[PDB]
Design an enzyme around this catalytic site. Structure first.
Site, PDB file in Angstrom:
ATOM      1  N   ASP A  34      63.562  26.048  18.663  1.00 38.35           N
ATOM      2  CA  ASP A  34      64.384  24.901  18.297  1.00 38.35           C
ATOM      3  C   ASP A  34      64.773  24.013  19.484  1.00 38.35           C
ATOM      4  O   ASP A  34      65.695  24.339  20.241  1.00 38.35           O
ATOM      5  CB  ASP A  34      65.636  25.389  17.552  1.00 38.35           C
ATOM      6  CG  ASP A  34      66.524  24.252  17.070  1.00 38.35           C
ATOM      7  OD1 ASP A  34      67.712  24.512  16.829  1.00 38.35           O
ATOM      8  OD2 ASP A  34      66.054  23.107  16.930  1.00 38.35           O
ATOM      9  N   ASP A 219      62.881  17.055  18.059  1.00 36.41           N
ATOM     10  CA  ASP A 219      63.447  18.272  17.500  1.00 36.41           C
ATOM     11  C   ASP A 219      62.449  19.108  16.705  1.00 36.41           C
ATOM     12  O   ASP A 219      62.030  18.724  15.611  1.00 36.41           O
ATOM     13  CB  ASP A 219      64.642  17.921  16.627  1.00 36.41           C
ATOM     14  CG  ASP A 219      65.434  19.132  16.215  1.00 36.41           C
ATOM     15  OD1 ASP A 219      65.132  20.258  16.689  1.00 36.41           O
ATOM     16  OD2 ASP A 219      66.369  18.944  15.420  1.00 36.41           O
TER      17      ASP A 219
HETATM   18  N1  LIG Z   1      67.672  21.481  15.411  1.00 36.97           N
HETATM   19  C1  LIG Z   1      68.706  21.976  14.726  1.00 36.97           C
HETATM   20  N2  LIG Z   1      68.924  23.300  14.723  1.00 36.97           N
HETATM   21  C2  LIG Z   1      69.946  23.841  14.046  1.00 36.97           C
HETATM   22  C3  LIG Z   1      70.138  25.217  14.067  1.00 36.97           C
HETATM   23  C4  LIG Z   1      71.189  25.795  13.364  1.00 36.97           C
HETATM   24  C5  LIG Z   1      72.050  24.984  12.639  1.00 36.97           C
HETATM   25  C6  LIG Z   1      71.863  23.606  12.613  1.00 36.97           C
HETATM   26  C7  LIG Z   1      70.809  23.034  13.318  1.00 36.97           C
HETATM   27  C8  LIG Z   1      70.611  21.659  13.301  1.00 36.97           C
HETATM   28  C9  LIG Z   1      69.544  21.116  14.012  1.00 36.97           C
HETATM   29  C10 LIG Z   1      69.364  19.604  13.969  1.00 36.97           C
HETATM   30  C11 LIG Z   1      69.743  19.018  15.328  1.00 36.97           C
HETATM   31  C12 LIG Z   1      71.265  18.926  15.482  1.00 36.97           C
HETATM   32  O1  LIG Z   1      71.927  18.215  14.733  1.00 36.97           O
HETATM   33  N3  LIG Z   1      71.806  19.644  16.457  1.00 36.97           N
HETATM   34  C13 LIG Z   1      73.256  19.567  16.687  1.00 36.97           C
HETATM   35  C14 LIG Z   1      73.906  20.939  16.788  1.00 36.97           C
HETATM   36  C15 LIG Z   1      74.065  21.523  15.387  1.00 36.97           C
HETATM   37  C16 LIG Z   1      74.763  22.878  15.476  1.00 36.97           C
HETATM   38  C17 LIG Z   1      73.965  23.844  16.353  1.00 36.97           C
HETATM   39  C18 LIG Z   1      73.699  23.250  17.731  1.00 36.97           C
HETATM   40  C19 LIG Z   1      73.042  21.868  17.631  1.00 36.97           C
END
Ligand SMILES: Nc1nc2ccccc2cc1CCC(=O)NCC1CCCCC1
Length: 363
Positions: A34, A219
């Site tokens: 991720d 992403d």
């Molecule tokens: N790429 C991702 N991974 C994830 C993994 C778990 C839960 C939500 C996710 C969301 C996204 C979308 C990118 C995003 O909005 N990131 C902002 C924060 C959201 C909370 C966790 C740290 C990063």
């Protein structure tokens, strides 16, 4: 780097995972890759969805940080207990590092029912780590503790998906032509700047500042190409104007229904800020990237957002992507594995002349 070729697996819509080991003796886990988060977080309890989970009690190298972490998002949460332990990637560099690990002890709409991964590897920077930027992300720990060069690259190939995560380098067999690089605007997400958008070669004539309201990121943990609504509707407006051999309902532009067989759709080009003043390049994707099968039948893989542009798997599966952290830049090249037909191939082209590329960024 032939060791690391084909080290990614997954299922359509469930993300790409790599095999990792945690603790001593090594406990094997499948871990989602991720680039839009920065926590290394793993299942630590017998959630019924889970094939396996981190058993801290079995690890002589485990250390408790005696601090919790709570991560709400849209629309779910995970939470857990922070520690450090020894971490390896069997099909990565031949090293072992002490990294932060969040042992997930409570969860809501996080793990996927039917998926084959038990944790998540946040590859973005400390600024978006939870609880705060003092929790050193995995890749930072890896670079500090070993001689692994400060970059990684992703070839996402697309029921079962495959791919490559090349840690510490670039495998030139994974792409054709040249890499083209766009600056990482700021080290939090992998933020970049889109400077021009062309549907079928036709400009959208929007203030480019809109394409990056309030950001644009790369992403691997997002399925879709996601666009700010104001840009999304203008994008859709053009897409459904370019598509007039068939007809499609307004619910589908989200989307809801599916085309089913036994060229009407336009190519999409994003121009990205280049390495040189007034210089850009463009990446071009096919309909075979934003039309994803569900379960000849396909869905609409572009949607709207309030947090900005998200270049997810729709974008990334057409390209070999180099997260060149050392030089604060991201490289794109045509992937050797991207899916193309006889009339059109995904492309990365430059240089182009683009003025006022700074004005495209939102502050
Ligand atoms: N790429 C991702 N991974 C994830 C993994 C778990 C839960 C939500 C996710 C969301 C996204 C979308 C990118 C995003 O909005 N990131 C902002 C924060 C959201 C909370 C966790 C740290 C990063």
């Amino acid at each position: 780097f032939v060791e690391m070729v084909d080290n990614l697996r997954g299922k359509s819509g469930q993300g790409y995972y790599v095999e990792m080991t945690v603790g001593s003796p090594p406990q094997t886990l499948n871990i989602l890759v991720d680039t839009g988060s920065s926590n290394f977080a793993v299942g630590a309890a017998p959630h019924p969805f889970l094939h396996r989970y981190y058993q801290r009690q079995l690890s002589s190298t485990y250390r408790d940080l005696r601090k919790g972490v709570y991560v709400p998002y849209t629309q779910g949460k995970w939470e857990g207990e922070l520690g450090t332990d020894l971490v390896s990637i069997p099909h990565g560099p031949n090293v072992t590092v002490r990294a932060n690990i969040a042992a997930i002890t409570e969860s809501d709409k996080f793990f996927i029912n039917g998926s084959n991964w038990e944790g998540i590897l946040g590859l973005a920077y400390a600024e978006i780590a939870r609880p705060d930027d003092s929790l050193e992300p995995f890749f930072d720990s890896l670079v500090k503790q070993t001689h692994v060069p400060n970059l990684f690259s992703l070839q996402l190939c697309g029921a079962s998906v495959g791919g490559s995560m090349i840690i510490g380098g670039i495998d030139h067999s994974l792409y054709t032509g040249s890499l083209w690089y766009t600056p990482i605007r700021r080290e939090w997400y992998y933020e970049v700047i889109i400077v021009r958008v062309e549907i079928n070669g036709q400009d959208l004539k929007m203030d480019c500042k809109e394409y990056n309201y309030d950001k644009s990121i790369v992403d691997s943990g997002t399925t879709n190409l996601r666009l700010p609504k104001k840009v999304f509707e203008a994008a859709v407006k053009s897409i459904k104007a370019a598509s007039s051999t068939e007809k499609f309902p307004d619910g589908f532009w989200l989307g809801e229904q599916l085309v089913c067989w036994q060229n009407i759709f336009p190519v999409i080009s994003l121009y990205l800020m280049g390495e040189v003043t007034n210089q850009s390049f463009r990446i071009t994707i096919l309909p075979q990237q934003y039309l994803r099968p569900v379960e000849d039948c396909y869905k609409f893989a572009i949607s709207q957002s309030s947090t900005g542009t998200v270049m997810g798997a729709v974008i990334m599966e057409g390209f070999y992507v180099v997260f060149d952290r050392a030089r604060k830049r991201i490289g794109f090249a045509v992937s050797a594995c991207h899916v193309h037909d006889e009339f059109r191939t995904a492309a990365v082209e430059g240089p182009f002349v683009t003025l006022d590329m700074e004005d495209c960024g939102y502050n």
